[PDB]
Amino acid sequence: KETAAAKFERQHMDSSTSAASSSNYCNQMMKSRNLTKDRCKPVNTFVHESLADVQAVCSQKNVACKNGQTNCYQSYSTMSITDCRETGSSKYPNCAYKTTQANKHIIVACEGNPYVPVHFDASV
Q: Which residues are annotated as a binding site?
A: 7, 10, 41-45, 66, 85
Is the distance from CB of 10 to CB of 34 less than 8 angstroms? yes
For residue 73, the 8-state DSSP code is E
Those residues whose C-beta lies under 8 Å from the C-beta of residue 112, and which sit 6 or more positions away, are 4, 5, 118
Separation of alpha carbons 25 and 99, rounded Å = 7
- Please give the sequence-ordered ranges of beta strands (E in DSSP) within the chain, or none if there are none: 43-47, 61-63, 72-74, 79-86, 97-104, 106-111, 116-123
Picking from 40, 108, 121, the residue whose alpha carbon sits closest to that of residue 75 is 108
Domain interval for residue 1: 1-124
The CATH number for 63's domain is: 3.10.130.10
For residue 94, the 8-state DSSP code is B
Separation of alpha carbons 34 and 2, rounded Å = 13
- Give the residue numbers annotated as catalytic, written as ranges: 12, 119
For residue 89, the 8-state DSSP code is S
Separation of alpha carbons 57 and 37, rounded Å = 30
| Model resolution, angstroms | 1.7
DSSP string spanning 8-35? HHHHHB-TT-SS---TTHHHHHHHHTTS
Put the strands of the sheet holding 106-111 in their side by side order: 61-63, 72-74, 106-111, 116-123
Side-chain half-sphere exposure of 19, counting CA atoms within 13 A: 8
Domain count, the chain: 1
Q: Which residues are annotated as a binding site for substrate?
A: 7, 10, 41-45, 66, 85
Query: Residue 47 is which amino acid?
Result: V
